[PDB]
Amino acid sequence: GAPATVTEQGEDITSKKDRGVLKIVKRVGNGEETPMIGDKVYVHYKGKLSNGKKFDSSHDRNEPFVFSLGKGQVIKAWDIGVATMKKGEIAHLLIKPEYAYGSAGSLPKIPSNATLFFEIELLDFKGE
């Protein structure tokens, strides 16, 4: 399902065009403005390893996930991906290890050389 559809006609949003981060918009946002680097960004997400063994949701807590875009608080794929989103957008991203946790991984939660999948809802973003 959702990951497979992202592989299939998945929009490659890397600069190098190496298919490291593929995207589909599933619910369209409003406003023309995507976040610039530095913006304080508020999201809900669901995430999983493609190996199917771990799943993580912002809802597993009772709060949005907040982070500063482009300030290395998240994996490179998030900085690239959420910079393409509009307020109120829901998107799916499929991510190769290079744009996530690489060969080292982040044990034991993230194995070596893992591919990741996320659904992200962009709630809001303000300047700082």
Ligand X SMILES: COc1cc2cc(OC)c1OCCCOC/C=C/COC(=O)[C@@H]1CCCCN1C(=O)[C@H]2C1CCCCC1
Contact positions toward ligand X, by CB under 6 A? 45, 47-49, 54, 56, 65, 74-75, 78, 106, 109-110, 116
Q: For the chain, how far is it from start to end, CA to CA, in angstroms?
A: 38
Minimum distance from CB of 65 to ligand X (Å)? 6
Minimum distance between the CB of residue 47 and ligand X, rounded to whole angstroms? 3
Nearer to ligand X, 7 or 73 (CB): 73
Residue whose beta carbon is closest to ligand X:
47
Distances (CA, A) of 105 to 75, 81, 100: 12, 20, 8
Which residues are the active-site residues? Answer: 45, 55-56, 75, 101, 118
Of the candidates 72, 123, 124, 127, the one whose C-alpha atom is nearest the C-alpha of residue 99 is 72
CA 17 to chain centre: 17
β partners of residue 12: 22
Nearer to ligand X, 48 or 92 (CB): 48
